[PDB]
Amino acid sequence: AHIEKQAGELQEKLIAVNRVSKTVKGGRIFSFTALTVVGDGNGRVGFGYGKAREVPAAIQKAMEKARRNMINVALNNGTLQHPVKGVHTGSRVFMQPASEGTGIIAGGAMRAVLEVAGVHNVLAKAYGSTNPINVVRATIDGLENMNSPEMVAAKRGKSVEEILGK
Amino acid sequence: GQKVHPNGIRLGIVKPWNSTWFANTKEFADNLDSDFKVRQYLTKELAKASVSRIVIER
Amino acid sequence: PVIKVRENEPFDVALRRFKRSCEKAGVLAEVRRREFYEKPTTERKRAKASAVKRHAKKLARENARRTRLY
Amino acid sequence: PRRRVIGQRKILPDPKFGSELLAKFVNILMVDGKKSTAESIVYSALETLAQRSGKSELEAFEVALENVRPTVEVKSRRVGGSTYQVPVEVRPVRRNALAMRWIVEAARKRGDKSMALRLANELSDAAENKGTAVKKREDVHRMAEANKAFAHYRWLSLRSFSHQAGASSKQPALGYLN
Amino acid sequence: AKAPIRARKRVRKQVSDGVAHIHASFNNTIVTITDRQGNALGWATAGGSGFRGSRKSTPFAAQVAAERCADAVKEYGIKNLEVMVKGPGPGRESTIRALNAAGFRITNITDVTPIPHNGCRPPKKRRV
Amino acid sequence: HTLRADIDYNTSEAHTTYGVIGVKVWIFKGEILGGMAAVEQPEKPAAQPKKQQRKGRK
Amino acid sequence: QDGTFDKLTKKEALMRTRELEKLENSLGGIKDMGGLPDALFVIDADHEHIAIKEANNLGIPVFAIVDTNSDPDGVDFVIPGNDDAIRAVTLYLGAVAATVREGRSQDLASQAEESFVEAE
RNA sequence: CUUGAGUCUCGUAGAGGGGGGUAGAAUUCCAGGUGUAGCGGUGAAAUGCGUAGAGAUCUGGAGGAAUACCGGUGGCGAAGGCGGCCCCCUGGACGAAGACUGACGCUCAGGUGCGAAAGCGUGGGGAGCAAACAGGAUUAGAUACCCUGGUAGUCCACGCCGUAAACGAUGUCGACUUGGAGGUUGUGCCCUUGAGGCGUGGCUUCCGGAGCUAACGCGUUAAGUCGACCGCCUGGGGAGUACGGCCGCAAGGUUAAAACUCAAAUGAAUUGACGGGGGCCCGCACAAGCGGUGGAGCAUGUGGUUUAAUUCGAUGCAACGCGA
RNA sequence: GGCUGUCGUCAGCUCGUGUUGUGAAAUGUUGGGUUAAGUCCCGCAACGAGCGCAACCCUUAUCCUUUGUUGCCAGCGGUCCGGCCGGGAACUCAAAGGAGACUGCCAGUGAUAAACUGGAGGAAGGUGGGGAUGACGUCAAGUCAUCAUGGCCCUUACGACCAGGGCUACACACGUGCUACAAUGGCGCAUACAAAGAGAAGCGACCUCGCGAGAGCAAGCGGACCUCAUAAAGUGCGUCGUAGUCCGGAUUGGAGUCUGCAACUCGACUCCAUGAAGUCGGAAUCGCUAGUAAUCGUGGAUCAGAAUGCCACGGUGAAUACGU
RNA sequence: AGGAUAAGUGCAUUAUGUUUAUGUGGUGAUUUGCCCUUCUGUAGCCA
């Protein structure tokens, strides 16, 4: 029954909660749906939507789905090495290189999602849909446009990426 | 929220109850009120410990 | 529509349900349609549209055998 | 509806007979629940027919029970388009029971001095094709024999069937395609 | 909607044979018997005993129309028959069977159904 | 719809500052485990040292 | 199979037996086997979508036989072919071949010393 | 220069444009012959037409729109636009070899030019249908729904400001990116073996991969990868109106706004319910019957109505021989 | 709060969990065929398990089986020929172990198939007959009035003792049920067989009284012992013709009774004379598949006093189930 | 006599599957919305 990935650190970021209705066909039951984010400290594509009778059983379901069919991904230093504009499904987010002298600057549940992602110093404005369910894809799409450091000279910088497989 | 009658309509047809005594005729009423009273007052006296079932028998 | 000639395995009543295909095929197969010069391409002339449902019906005969419903 | 077909049950015999045509005649002659009178009502009737002619006790009974008796019935069905009918062939068991029912309603209002005289005269009257349910048998069979030219919602059913595999003819159907 | 069945009453031809013309629609049938020289020996229609609605065009009102007209042309002393058919309308088959069951031959069932070229505009005051 | 073996039931009723609370607690031990079982004999042949009073046989 | 499944209503027992048989016939693969398999052998694509669907989710490498109504992408190893009958399904995957029989001569120095009998 | 585009003869497809020619049959009418009562309309229906002889039918004349089925997801035109068939005058596109020119290219503010339809001036013309107007049917009515008479209109041609869902729905045009197949077509090859296959182009459409969307969907005709250069948007309602410039006999058209109101408005989709869109299923719920309440009288409850008060609780199925 | 009615025996709902989509959420829990059934053949992302349903369960049916009275009697005695009693155990018979029957078989049907129908022996075949038997849960559904209970009010009272009046009035309508309108029935005379159960302030043989119901006294009782109890319809014969009768018997005069100082309106039963409404009831409308439905009596719960009902029993005991 | 591909016996209402009146606005389900991990970390929030 599946392989799972782990981090040596705890994430229990509950982002949303909902309830399921059929309203006449068996009427309406007490069930909830839930969305929970499991990072790594440097990032994961870990996002899980699950559902059950009660809120606790529901979140723990959703926390399980945030670590199966998912793998961890990694980025050196608290910044991102590319000024790129991550888009995922109308929720569009921005990054530009920065200092360590600034840490996070963000609010709500977003400051908690960016800390595990490693893209919190580079944190620039979000636009399009910025309600909780889709705003939180920073650590997914913003780590699939990824750049990360491996060179010793800027003029060997494109040469060094070519010889990584040649 | 229909709440089917969860145990009353299920007893005595190889399903034991919390009383076992015999009475009949018109005095069944005098024995049942007395059995309620002893159920109410006796478990209150032994309430020092928790208790799992109660069976009174004549 | 009854047609002058007779059907296969024939009897003394001629009928169109066996050996007609072009008779009243756009002359009275119409319902309240007015005089038009381009509206039929999407109103009337649904041959691409109607061919699909027939194709789907030939597709399902293979697929019932393949699940072994027979 | 109905998840399954369900047939008739066993019916018990009566203390004066072992023949079925007699036991089924006393049964639908039963009113107030009391068959033990109806036993006599059947045998007192049959003796009066038998005095009218002595060749049999069954003379007028057997052809009345053919003549006031239907063969076919018509239901009315429509869920769109225009109004239609669907004829059905029915079981002997119900053909017989309409006929016996109609004989015992007609005879009890016939108003003669004995229930024995009333039934022998009302079977004598329908036997000769001039009693009271000859009209009812003739009208009901005419309507079912006639509505065989119709089918449930014919106008859309004629295209609907040939698209979903079916015939190009004109046929009656049980509330479906044709 | 029936012609004279009784003798001497109207002009007779007594030519043993005729042709019938059937105009089949979704709202009526007109069945009209004529002489082979081209003169009407009788007619009927499907409102000849008061069918109305859909029921006015169906096989059974088409049949009784054919049975009213076929009756009369036995006093005009006709015995044999031919038929012309005009429309993909209902009772177009029940009508043939009725002529032949009336005690006539129906060997030549000649489709001559006319073609309009759609020169008119049909009644619309609605969405369809 | 069970009607065989005793199975344990309680209706609590209690109040606190805001008003009344309650739990309906059905618990299920066994479908032939627990309770009585159906008796497996008549009481009529057993434990009878003399199979008659007279019965016409003396 | 010993006969030890009896009940005073025979219907409830024989009906459980027919449905037990369907479980035996459906599960017979993982049933006698020590755990999750080291490859997954999908013969059909055309109706048995699920067997490929779950192999990608457990990460277990796929050994695939694809037909001309299926793509050779998204599975790790292919036989180009057709999905039916013995035309590609054991004509390379049996003792008649040499390539399923020279892999197995490379098992005989890795986890075993002799195991070539077992396999076709 | 050709790697872009342009052009000659050769061939080919098509309802492009302008102008000519031509036949048969339903509705409609007249006439004569034959012939008698419904015909019509529709969901069902009535109003309508008809005994002054209708409806239908044989023969022969009248007349104008209209032209099937072939006709297809086809093809053509600049986009909207083009439809009986044929020719004359001529456009614009599609293929192929010989031959030529050789960035002559791309986009486009302004601009001039240009209509499906009705609106609309005059000329042509009127069989059927129709806003209006009447009358029927429907109903709380009935202007919607549905029908029947019935006119301008429809129907033709040009002409006046060219309206719109005036579209590869996707600006213009072009380069590049796994294909296969449908429709249907130049042409090489085939048993020309059935709208086919392969070779190589064609518009035009299904299907789906790399990539894209919020979803439908797109995918070699992009909504991909992009290019140049122009158009246009900044919440909704109120407004495609006002206001300004301009064109128009003349109603109008054209780009295109706020105070005020208001927290929304708006693209998509899940499941319930629901179709009067298509179809499937069940309970003695009907049927197949039989009997019962409702009607009599009584028993008993309910309300109505009454008095000091005739106590409530409950209101088809989920109240009324029930708490009580 | 506790508690329960509905959809419905819908034939589906839910618990844990994976997966597909960005997700809401689906999927399963949906299709075909089959069913009381998530039962069973086929099959797609559903997997595992529970609920509804199946089961254990009490009961019946023959039949085996034991007890042998407060039950029974083939032969036998006392004998009016009654298990009352000497006596007997073949026998029902009571309450219980249960046996037997499983859609298991065979055949048809059914997609191979679950299963339905037929077929047969037998007491009995449709998951043997009967009953138990009803999911999660919206419905702001209904009870604060069994009872629990806060916020929160009276506590010379929204408590409590005592009498009398009223729901049950009467105008009618309405729910339900009862018994009639017939003759399958009523009448007259003669004639028959139950099952079950209730009785410790009670009922109750005999007793004396009584038109009958009942009355007070009391042996007796614990209800298979004693009593309610003449069980009635039904059966036998004769009789009756749609006439309110040969059906129905309400009202009302007038007498007799019950629990209790006390029966007038509000209570119940007996009985004498006369005598009306009612001819199978319109709109509406339900229950029922067989011990049912119909119909007649019986007892009981309730119960100070009493039933037309309900509840359960036994008499006599039906048509049909194609079809949606 | 080509109305003779005889239906290519390839055929099935043949392309709008349509119509006989309606009935206001909001309202159900919780005050710990809490029971998976070292370091880089988390749901009021922590190793």
> Can you say whether the dihedral through the CA atoms of A71, A74, A78, A84 is positive or negative?
negative
> Can you say whether the dihedral through the CA atoms of B13, B15, B21, B25 is positive or negative?
negative
Hey, are the CB atoms on D169 and C17 less than 8 Å from each other? yes
In this complex, is the C-beta atom of G47 within 8 Å of any C-beta atom belonging to chain C? yes
Measured CA to CA, the distance from residue D147 to residue D128 in angstroms comes to 29
Annotation: CATH topology of D20-143: Ribosomal Protein S7 (1.10.455)
Measured CA to CA, the distance from residue G120 to residue C41 in angstroms comes to 62
Block residue for tokens 């963000």: A106
Smallest CA–C1' distance to I112, residue: C70
Strand partners, E78: E16
- Nearest-Cα distance to chain B for F13, in Å, is 15
In whole angstroms, I276 C1' to D107 CA is: 32
- Nearest-Cα distance to chain G for C3, in Å, is 45
Helix (H, G, I), strand (E, B) or coil at G64: strand
Measured CA to CA, the distance from residue F21 to residue D130 in angstroms comes to 82
- Strands F24-27 and B56-57 turn out to be unpaired
In this complex, is the C-beta atom of F23 within 8 Å of any C-beta atom belonging to chain B? no
In this complex, is the C-beta atom of D149 within 8 Å of any C-beta atom belonging to chain E? yes
- Phi-psi label, residue E19: left if phi above 0, alpha if psi -120 to 50, beta otherwise: beta
Which nucleotides in chain H lie less than 7 Å from some protein C-beta?
15, 24-27, 33-46, 54-59, 64-73, 81-83, 116, 127-131, 145-148, 153-155, 205-206, 209, 213-215, 271-273, 276-286, 288-291
Identity of the residue in E96, E121, E128 whose CB atom sits nearest the CB atom of C13: E96
In this complex, is the C-beta atom of C53 within 8 Å of any C-beta atom belonging to chain D? yes
Q: Which of E92, E100, E109 to mutate to test the interface with C (most CBs of C within 10 A)?
A: E109
In this complex, is the C-beta atom of F8 within 8 Å of any C-beta atom belonging to chain B? yes
Q: At what angle do helices E59-72 and E94-101 cross, to 10 degrees?
A: 30
In this complex, is the C-beta atom of G48 within 8 Å of any C-beta atom belonging to chain C? no
Helix (H, G, I), strand (E, B) or coil at G54: helix
Chain C hits for D169, Cβ within 8 Å: 17
Gyration radius of chain D's alpha carbons: 21
Calculate the CA dihedral of residues E64, E69, E75, E79 and round it to 10 degrees: -90
> Can you say whether the dihedral through the CA atoms of E26, E28, E31, E37 is positive or negative?
negative
Identity of the residue in D83, D149, D155 whose CB atom sits nearest the CB atom of E59: D149
Lookup: tokens for G68: 């001309």
Q: Write down which chains contact chain E via at least 3 CB pairs under 8 A.
A: C, D
Chain F hits for B10, Cβ within 8 Å: 2-3
Measured CA to CA, the distance from residue C70 to residue C65 in angstroms comes to 6
> Can you say whether the dihedral through the CA atoms of G80, G84, G86, G87 is positive or negative?
negative
- Phi-psi label, residue D19: left if phi above 0, alpha if psi -120 to 50, beta otherwise: beta
Block residue for tokens 């992602």: A117
Block residue for tokens 């509330």: D175
Chain C hits for E23, Cβ within 8 Å: none
Chain C hits for E88, Cβ within 8 Å: 1, 16, 23-24, 28
Lookup: tokens for A36: 């929970």
In whole angstroms, I272 C1' to B20 CA is: 57
Measured CA to CA, the distance from residue A12 to residue B43 in angstroms comes to 47
Sheet holding A13-19, edge to edge: A13-19, A32-37, A47-52
> Can you say whether the dihedral through the CA atoms of E92, E98, E101, E104 is positive or negative?
negative
Tell me the residue type at D150. Answer: F
Please list, in sequence order, all residues whose beta carbon lies within 8 angstroms of the beta carbon of residue D146, skipping any fewer than 6 positions away: E60
Chain G hits for A3, Cβ within 8 Å: 58-59
Hey, are the CB atoms on E111 and C4 less than 8 Å from each other? yes
In this complex, is the C-beta atom of F3 within 8 Å of any C-beta atom belonging to chain B? yes
Hey, are the CB atoms on E94 and D149 less than 8 Å from each other? yes
Residue from E19, E1, E21, E2 nearest E92 by CA: E21
Measured CA to CA in angstroms, residue D47 lies from C46, D27, D63 at distances of 78, 19, 17
Chain C hits for D168, Cβ within 8 Å: 17-18
- Nearest-Cα distance to chain C for E30, in Å, is 16
In this complex, is the C-beta atom of C65 within 8 Å of any C-beta atom belonging to chain G? no
Hey, are the CB atoms on C12 and E100 less than 8 Å from each other? yes
Tell me the residue type at B45. Answer: E
Measured CA to CA, the distance from residue E18 to residue E1 in angstroms comes to 19
Hey, are the CB atoms on D83 and E58 less than 8 Å from each other? no
- 3-state secondary structure labels for all residues of B11-38: CCCCCCCCEECCCCHHHHHHHHHHHHHH
Residue from D151, D5, D24 nearest D87 by CA: D151
List helix spans (H) across A38-156: 55-65, 110-117, 132-135, 138-141
Q: Is residue D70 within 8 Å of D98, Cβ to Cβ?
A: yes
The H or E element containing residue F9 is strand F8-11
In this complex, is the C-beta atom of F22 within 8 Å of any C-beta atom belonging to chain B? no
Measured CA to CA, the distance from residue D39 to residue D47 in angstroms comes to 13
Measured CA to CA, the distance from residue B20 to residue B17 in angstroms comes to 7
Hey, are the CB atoms on F8 and B13 less than 8 Å from each other? no
Helix (H, G, I), strand (E, B) or coil at A17: strand
Helices (H) and strands (E) in chain C, counts: 2, 0
Residue from D12, D67, D14, D68 nearest D43 by CA: D14
Measured CA to CA in angstroms, residue A101 lies from A126, B33, B34 at distances of 21, 82, 83
Measured CA to CA, the distance from residue D98 to residue D126 in angstroms comes to 14
Block residue for tokens 């839930």: A34
Hey, are the CB atoms on D155 and E60 less than 8 Å from each other? no
Tell me the residue type at G9. Answer: T
Q: What is the DSSP letter of F17?
A: T
Residue from E108, E48, E44 nearest E70 by CA: E44
Which nucleotides in chain J lie less than 7 Å from some protein C-beta?
4, 6-19, 28-31, 33-45, 47
Chains G and F touch (3+ CB pairs under 8 A): no
Smallest CA–C1' distance to I104, residue: G10
The H or E element containing residue B43 is helix B28-45
Measured CA to CA in angstroms, residue C50 lies from C15, C57, D165 at distances of 26, 12, 16
Give the residue on C whose Cα is nearest the Cα of D164: C57
Lookup: tokens for A21: 């209705």
Lookup: tokens for D72: 């076919």
Please list, in sequence order, all residues whose beta carbon lies within 8 angstroms of the beta carbon of residue G68, skipping any fewer than 6 positions away: G82
Measured CA to CA, the distance from residue A99 to residue F33 in angstroms comes to 71
Hey, are the CB atoms on B15 and F37 less than 8 Å from each other? no
Compute φ and ψ for D123, nearest 5 degrees: -70, -45
- Nearest-Cα distance to chain C for E2, in Å, is 25
Measured CA to CA, the distance from residue A39 to residue F27 in angstroms comes to 41
Distance of CA E1 to the CA centre of its chain: 11
In whole angstroms, H29 C1' to E40 CA is: 22
- Nearest-Cα distance to chain E for C47, in Å, is 20
Q: Is residue D138 within 8 Å of D68, Cβ to Cβ?
A: no
Chain C hits for G85, Cβ within 8 Å: none
In this complex, is the C-beta atom of D153 within 8 Å of any C-beta atom belonging to chain E? no
